[PDB]
């Protein structure tokens, strides 16, 4: 789906598989978080379903030792003094030793501050221990987490249930037409993008000799030239769009290991799973009720939340017993109006637009010479039109799909292309869709705050700040303190600070709250990026203070207060809202669950081969299932006819469903249901 998703895949740790255990055999012990998992296996990252606890992610700093166990880095302490010498310890090895926590205060030389410090001991037991007895200490605070876990700002403010989803959803983010880095980060966003392998890094240092949309050419120091080719509009496994664009301009001095061209969900080499949205935490006319989400039409018009999706359609020409399938522009009984967007071969032309039901690859096959209908024979003598022996077997666009034809790939057996035994010509047609955001589309933050788009209001209906700026997204207040994920609150506060900028007051000295604050942050520009590393980063003290330091807008007016709230005007009534509303900036990702995929419906269609019941799935144009649980509800209603109807004529009554169609289009009444063909199968299976 995105770069990060691929990375997470390469680091997943499964118990499932041959030689391992089954899902049913696994009890409640195998799944829960073990004390040894510290710094080796992430305790947050795991699936939410029946797979839970059986699938995890390898921790950030850990590595695998030549015996197949999981080691992890710890800092060595000789005698109360931290040493930069690092040794990797296995799980049982760590048990024999005693580990101090990472955040324990350390002398500038390397000594401990307090005699008794926080200590990790075998069997997951904790106690205070004099500094004389400390063997090792942790490498980093964020040592226990995975790569996906670490990108959740203010993680220690979100409960393990929403933090879990927060990590399990980042993988599900869709690459956008163009991507922005988040205003609020944790620092991980850089290394993650680079290691993923869906960006372009410079191997050897040098200078940009020539740059194009197609490729980048780098002139090394030693004289040799290495050229990197850009992936442009390529279909991913999941139909998302991996499109790389050069960062550097021609003649730029570039050093080795630097990002010169990023890919999908990447801004200047940083993981960019979403956009920076102006949020407003208030109920609004019941349209954001029960985790629904309200949008500004701005996000539609400015393609802020827009993405491309590419499909791969395929079809072949085989040898049959009645001859051989040939791909031709001549399809029986079709106007030249439909064949308009075809070339002389029979294939669609690049650049053409295609809708559902339209022709992509016109292929015809010889049909069996069976005695044609005496009623159709008669109909062919009147109009004197001799029947062709070729049946239409063309590739038409599946229901729902649509877009521009962005490439054709032809393989011919004639042109020596090695095809499987029996095939002659094989055509692939790639169609892309520029899907704008719409109602029902699933949006999410990093803190397990999901939701689908309820209503997209016109830009003027939006509750706006004093200077006229209309907000972007209107999250409901009710669904915040229940989920124990108030990180989204802290992200919003710091988000406004990161957008307006700030300046701490240095007059009468550096304030006591911003005393621990690093010098570089004491003054900030509008639209500035920051890092809030997990188990470190901003504290609620510094955050409250920064709300006071918020720089005024272009009109010299402050917009939000020290509470972090601001006054809103209802874009509908005009009257300003009676109470202060929490307003700020929050990072939101467009997840890969869009209505344009999810919607499906069926009148009639194909049917099963044995049970003669309707097939199942959107890919098979199937019908829904009225299961055993759903029958009980009908019976509990007393709707005997509705229940009978569904399981009879609407399903596997061979003669029924045929005579129901007739009765409807002729505008008559529905006939009495017959015998289920599936039941007839049972009596034969018993016999």
């Amino acid at each position: 789906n995105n770069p990060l998703s691929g990375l997470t895949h390469k680091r997943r740790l499964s118990a499932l598989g041959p030689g391992g255990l089954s899902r049913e055999r696994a009890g409640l012990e195998v799944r829960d978080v073990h004390p040894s998992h510290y710094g080796r296996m992430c305790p947050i990252e795991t699936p939410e379903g029946p797979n839970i606890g059986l699938i995890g992610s390898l921790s950030v700093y850990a590595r695998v030792n030549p015996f197949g166990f999981i080691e992890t880095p710890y800092r060595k302490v000789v005698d109360g003094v931290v040493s930069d010498e690092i040794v990797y310890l296995t799980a049982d090895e760590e048990d024999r030793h005693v580990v101090a926590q990472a955040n324990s205060p350390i002398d500038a030389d390397g000594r401990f501050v307090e005699p008794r410090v926080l200590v990790r001991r075998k069997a997951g037991e904790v106690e205070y221990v004099p500094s004389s007895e400390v063997d090792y200490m942790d490498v980093s605070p964020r040592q226990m987490v995975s790569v996906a876990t670490a990108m959740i700002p203010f993680l220690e403010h979100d409960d393990a249930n929403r933090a879990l989803m927060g990590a399990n959803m980042q993988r599900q983010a869709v690459p956008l037409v163009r991507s922005e880095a988040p205003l609020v980060g944790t620092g991980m966003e850089l290394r993650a993008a680079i290691d993923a392998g869906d960006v372009v890094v410079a191997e050897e240092s040098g200078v940009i000799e020539e740059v194009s949309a197609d490729y980048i050419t780098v002139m090394h120091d030693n004289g040799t030239r290495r050229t990197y080719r850009m992936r442009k509009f390529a279909r991913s496994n999941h139909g998302t769009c991996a499109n790389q664009c050069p960062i550097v301009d021609a003649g730029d001095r570039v050093e080795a290991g630097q990002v010169i061209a990023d890919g999908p969900c990447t801004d200047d080499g940083e993981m960019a799973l979403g956009k920076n949205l102006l949020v407003a935490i208030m109920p609004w006319e019941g349209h954001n009720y029960e985790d629904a989400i309200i949008l500004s039409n701005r996000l539609v018009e400015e393609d802020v939340l827009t993405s491309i999706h590419i499909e791969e359609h395929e079809i072949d020409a085989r040898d049959t017993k009645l001859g051989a399938e040939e791909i031709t522009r001549d399809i029986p009984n079709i106007s030249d109006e439909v064949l308009a967007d075809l070339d002389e071969r029979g294939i669609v032309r690049i650049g053409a637009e295609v809708r559902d039901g339209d022709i992509l690859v016109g292929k015809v096959t010889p049909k069996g010479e069976t005695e044609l209908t005496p009623e159709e024979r008669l109909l062919r003598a009147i109009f004197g039109e001799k029947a062709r022996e070729v049946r239409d077997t063309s590739l038409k666009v599946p229901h729902g799909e649509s877009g521009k034809v962005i490439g054709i790939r032809v393989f011919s057996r004639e042109d020596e292309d090695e095809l499987p035994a029996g095939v002659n010509e094989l055509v692939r047609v790639y169609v892309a869709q520029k899907r704008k955001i719409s109602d029902g589309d699933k949006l999410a933050g990093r803190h397990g705050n999901k939701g689908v788009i309820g209503k997209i209001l016109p830009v003027e209906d939006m509750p706006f700040l004093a200077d006229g700026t209309p907000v972007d997204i209107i999250l409901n207040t009710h669904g915040v303190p229940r989920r124990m994920n108030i990180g989204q609150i802290l992200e919003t506060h710091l988000g406004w600070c990161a957008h307006s900028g700030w300046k701490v007051d240095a007059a009468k000295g550096v304030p006591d709250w911003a005393a621990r604050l690093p010098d570089e942050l004491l003054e900030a520009q509008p639209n500035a990026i920051v890092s809030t590393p997990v188990f470190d980063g901003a504290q609620e003290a510094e955050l409250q203070g920064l709300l006071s330091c918020t720089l005024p807008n272009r009109d010299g007016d402050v917009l939000v207060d020290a509470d972090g709230k601001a006054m809103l005007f209802d874009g509908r009534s005009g009257e300003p809202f009676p109470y202060p509303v929490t307003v700020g900036y929050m990072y939101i990702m467009k997840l890969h669950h869009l209505v344009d995929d999810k919607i499906h419906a069926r009148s009639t269609g194909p049917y099963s081969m044995i049970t003669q019941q309707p097939l199942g799935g959107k890919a098979q144009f199937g019908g829904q299932r009225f299961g055993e649980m759903e029958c009980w509800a009908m019976q509990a209603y007393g709707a005997a006819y509705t229940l009978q109807e569904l399981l009879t004529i609407k399903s596997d009554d061979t003669v029924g469903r045929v005579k129901v169609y007739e009765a409807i289009v002729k505008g008559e009444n529905i006939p009495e249901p017959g015998i289920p063909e599936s039941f007839k199968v049972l009596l034969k299976e018993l016999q």
């Binding site: 950030v60 700093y61 880095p73 800092r75 930069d84 690092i86 955040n103 490498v139 980093s140 880095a181 980060g185 620092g187 991980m188 966003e189 850089l190 290394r191 680079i194 570039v254 050093e255 290991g257 630097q258 990002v259 200047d268 080499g269 940083e270 604050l517 690093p518 570089e520 942050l521 900030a524 500035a528 990026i529 920051v530 890092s531 809030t532 590393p533 470190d536 980063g537 901003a538 504290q539 510094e542």
Partner: peptide, 23 residues
């Protein structure tokens, strides 16, 4: 700064100094 190693955009970090080892 957080990761002053490749040639990356500067992201200012609230932090205790983290110099044990790079990811």
């Amino acid at each position: 700064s957080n990761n002053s190693v490749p040639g990356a955009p500067n992201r200012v970090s609230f932090a205790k100094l983290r110099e044990p080892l790079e990811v």
